[PDB]
Amino acid sequence: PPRDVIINKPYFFVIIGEEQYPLFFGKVSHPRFK
């Protein structure tokens, strides 16, 4: 059965399209929506 992904540790993100150019980049260590 496919392994789940749990983002439970500091992470990088990139937003990409088909050329895979990094439109946005970030690192999250303390996730907040405020």
Binding site: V5, K9, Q20
Partner: protein
């Protein structure tokens, strides 16, 4: 609208190099967002006017000479303008230049900025600096659908300003599979119990000793958010940042499987003054009288202030991201 594959590879290398270099030169630590894509586009408009050692230093930091010069403006058009339809996704990239009425742009410079569909206004910084600041801030606010407000703070522009180059980027996409907010908060390592979102989604994921990654698709499966979660953030920072391009490539190339994905709900906003970081990256002559912008305009111009702001908002429905980059010349 169709570049050579090697040239696309050369620009993928340059843009990831700039992204990692910006990360690696940053003072803001545990939580940061930025668009080096925006920075590249704003500085591309400065670089079109650069010559001599200023040109070379811009090439070193941003990778502008990774492709033939005769394809440079066309490459910029390729990344500013829509190539393939975005469908449900919104990607809006705009540029604006506010130039002193006393500035005479070269024929080459005027042609490039018109070819790129860059807004051009001739203004009176000597007496209207505050009104111009508000106008630019309104331009950015509109371009970013209100996400980036008050971009240029008081003092950034003045009566001594001769030009302001602004790039803005707006991104809005819904997740292909909307997340469900998990009733119970989830402990995030080094942090606290946080609101997370989860769903069984069809996605590519890589599980390796150094990191776990997932590509979370937007509606249409043409855009995604790629999350790269190191197993040890510090070691990854010290040894693996340089292969970000390949970790993204490997993640997108992996088979999609239907699996549970849990991610935090999160918003991040970052502002910075770019000048000192750009000098540490090797952009030195642009910031003083050594500056050579003789292809832009006649006269003696230099960068007073380079500013960036970025916002990313990730909820159970999707992502809104915006950024702006401003360059003020004296």
């Amino acid at each position: 609208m169709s570049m050579d594959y090697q040239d696309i590879e050369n620009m993928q290398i340059a843009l990831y190099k700039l992204c990692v270099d910006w990360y690696n030169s940053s003072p803001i630590k545990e939580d940061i967002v930025f668009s080096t894509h925006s920075m590249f586009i704003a500085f591309s408009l400065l670089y079109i006017g650069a010559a001599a050692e200023t040109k070379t230093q811009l090439e070193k930091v941003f990778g502008f000479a990774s492709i033939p010069e005769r394809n440079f403006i066309k490459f910029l058009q390729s990344i500013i303008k829509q190539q393939d339809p975005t469908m449900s996704v919104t990607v809006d990239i705009v540029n604006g230049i506010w130039a002193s009425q006393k500035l005479e742009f070269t024929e080459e410079y005027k042609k490039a900025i018109t070819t790129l569909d860059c807004q051009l206004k001739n203004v009176n910084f000597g007496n209207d600096s505050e009104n111009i600041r508000q106008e630019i801030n309104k331009f950015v606010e509109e371009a970013t659908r209100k996400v980036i407000v008050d971009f240029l703070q008081p003092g950034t522009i003045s009566g001594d300003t001769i030009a302001v180059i602004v790039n803005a980027i707006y991104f809005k996409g819904e997740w292909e599979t909307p997340f469900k907010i998990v009733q119970k908060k989830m402990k995030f390592e080094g942090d606290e119990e946080v609101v997370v979102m989860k769903e069984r989604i069809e996605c590519s994921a890589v599980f390796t000793e150094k990191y776990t990654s997932v590509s979370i698709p937007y509606v249409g499966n043409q855009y995604s958010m790629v999350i790269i979660m190191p197993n040890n953030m510090k070691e990854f920072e010290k040894e693996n940042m340089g292969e970000l391009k390949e970790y993204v490539r490997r993640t997108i190339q992996e088979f999609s499987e239907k699996r549970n994905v849990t991610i935090p709900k999160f918003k991040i906003e970052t502002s910075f003054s770019m000048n000192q970081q750009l000098k540490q990256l090797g952009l030195i002559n642009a910031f003083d009288e050594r500056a050579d912008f003789s292809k832009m305009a006649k006269g003696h111009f230099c960068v007073s202030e380079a500013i960036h702001k970025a916002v990313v908002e990730v909820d159970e429905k999707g992502t809104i991201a915006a950024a702006a980059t401003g360059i003020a010349l004296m």
